[PDB]
């Protein structure tokens, strides 16, 4: 057993950028139509729309750089290190800010249905000014370890734009805090406030109206069911990389093929706003 050897299957390199191209086309057309009907024209109905426009513009800034990931999926680069820095920091900021905004809309609905009487000004100021310090600034300060540590490197026979940490301990602690900021803690906040939302809804079955929480509910469930196996796969990569559950090189590259396919399938979070706007759901 010399070491772990890198051998990617050929079906990865052809099923992968087709998925990137599909999500690129639908993302460009969907985010373009959404921003031109909403942000350029100011046709707002509720405070949720501004939150989803912030989500859509972070999603749009993702889908400029998405074909560079498509190029990396099949081939090797010739552009430079600066574009690799830009694509990695834009990946991290959209991946963080998306679930951040999806937490803010959940607490917005919690403020909407529970404190229905004594909350009109806090909703307005939260949707007006507080999300700029709540969304982008923590996310962009989370991009600084990507901005001052990541680099390109040559695996001799090819060019790779990916992450390079000083040790594997850095890798596991960075993914661990990544899981804590991406799935767990916003998940606890979102699901707890939804428990409170349905608890207060149970006290008001005599007047229904509404039928408007279903859009936010299908958004959060679509996002989480989209993003879950990627987190599961990188947690398995974490557990073998922290050498508790060592099994061999075949499990390592099986995990690597798994995480590649699950991140490719998990990037459908770009195509979750505008198809639900078109379906009005």
């Amino acid at each position: 057993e010399p070491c772990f050897r890198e051998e990617n299957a050929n079906f990865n390199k052809i099923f992968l950028p087709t998925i990137y191209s599909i999500i690129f086309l639908t993302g460009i057309v969907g985010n373009g139509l959404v921003i031109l009907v909403m942000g350029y024209q100011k046709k707002l109905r509720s405070m949720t729309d501004k939150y989803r426009l912030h989500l859509s513009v972070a999603d749009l800034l993702f889908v400029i750089t998405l074909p560079f990931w498509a190029v990396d999926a099949v081939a090797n680069w010739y552009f430079g290190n600066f574009l690799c820095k830009a694509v990695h920091v834009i990946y991290t900021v959209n991946l963080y800010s998306s679930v951040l905004i999806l937490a803010f809309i959940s607490l917005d609905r919690y403020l909407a249905i529970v404190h229905a009487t004594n909350s009109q000004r806090p909703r307005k100021l939260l949707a007006e000014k507080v999300v700029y310090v709540g969304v982008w600034i923590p996310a962009l300060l989370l991009t600084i370890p990507d901005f001052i540590f990541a680099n390109v490197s040559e695996a001799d026979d090819r060019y790779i734009c990916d992450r390079f940490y000083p040790n594997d301990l850095w890798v596991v602690v960075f993914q661990f805090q990544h899981i804590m900021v991406g799935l767990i803690l916003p998940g606890i906040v979102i699901l707890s406030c939804y428990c409170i939302i349905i608890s207060k809804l149970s006290h008001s079955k005599g007047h229904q109206k509404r039928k408007a929480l279903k859009t936010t509910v299908i958004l959060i469930l679509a996002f989480f069911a989209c993003w879950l196996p990627y987190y599961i796969g990188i947690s398995i990569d974490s557990f073998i990389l922290l050498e508790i559950i060592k099994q061999g090189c075949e499990f390592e590259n099986t995990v690597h093929k798994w995480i590649s396919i699950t991140e490719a399938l998990a990037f459908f979070h770009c195509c979750l706003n505008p198809i639900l706007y078109a379906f009005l759901g």
């Binding site: 070491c3 772990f4 990916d162 992450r163 390079f164």
Partner: protein
């Protein structure tokens, strides 16, 4: 050949495409393979001993002529190997190779010997010992051709060829035919 820490591409550790090398747990453990038609050479040695007129045993048979190691509690240089492999001194147990040559059934027979490094060696010319540095890391390999044998041959009921650590016998072999004369 003594292996060291197995390596991979340098650093290359990140969120994706991360590998883990293999460390050397025993820096002192080495390996030594002796190659060639060894048993044919040793039966030629037995035939030469039967050819020798100063051999007092039964020259009609070579099966009684056996190559034996010295007993335990003896010298590390006389029981195990002593040789220099690029600044380091190899000590190999001669159970497996001696059993593989002599075809002693019921024991372990292999064409190599399990080796351990020693920074502390004896002195073959003077009286003393020498203590060296801790061994260098990385790959340590050596290659040579075996050409002669240091041993002692006792003549009795059975012929026990007992190997010795007489390092000076190699130079006595190489310079025994030459003799300095003064015209």
């Amino acid at each position: 050949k003594r292996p060291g820490n197995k390596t991979v591409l340098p650093i290359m550790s990140g969120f994706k495409f991360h590998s883990k090398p293999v460390i050397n747990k025993k820096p002192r453990q080495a390996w030594c393979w002796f190659k060639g038609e060894w048993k044919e050479a040793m039966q030629e040695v037995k035939e030469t001993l039967a050819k020798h007129p100063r051999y007092k045993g039964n020259r009609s048979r070579t099966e009684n002529i056996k190559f034996k190691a010295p007993g335990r509690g003896s010298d590390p240089e006389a029981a195990y190997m002593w040789t220099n492999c690029r600044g380091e001194f190899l000590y190999c147990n001669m159970t497996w190779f001696l059993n593989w040559v002599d075809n002693r059934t019921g024991q372990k027979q292999r064409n190599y010997a399990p080796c351990h490094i020693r920074q502390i060696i004896n002195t073959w010319h003077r009286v003393g010992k020498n203590v060296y540095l801790p061994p260098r890391e990385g790959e340590l390999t050596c290659n040579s051709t075996v050409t002669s044998i240091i041993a002692n041959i006792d003549t009795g009921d059975q012929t026990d060829i007992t190997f010795s650590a007489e390092v000076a016998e190699l130079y006595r072999l190489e310079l025994g035919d030459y003799k300095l004369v003064e015209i």
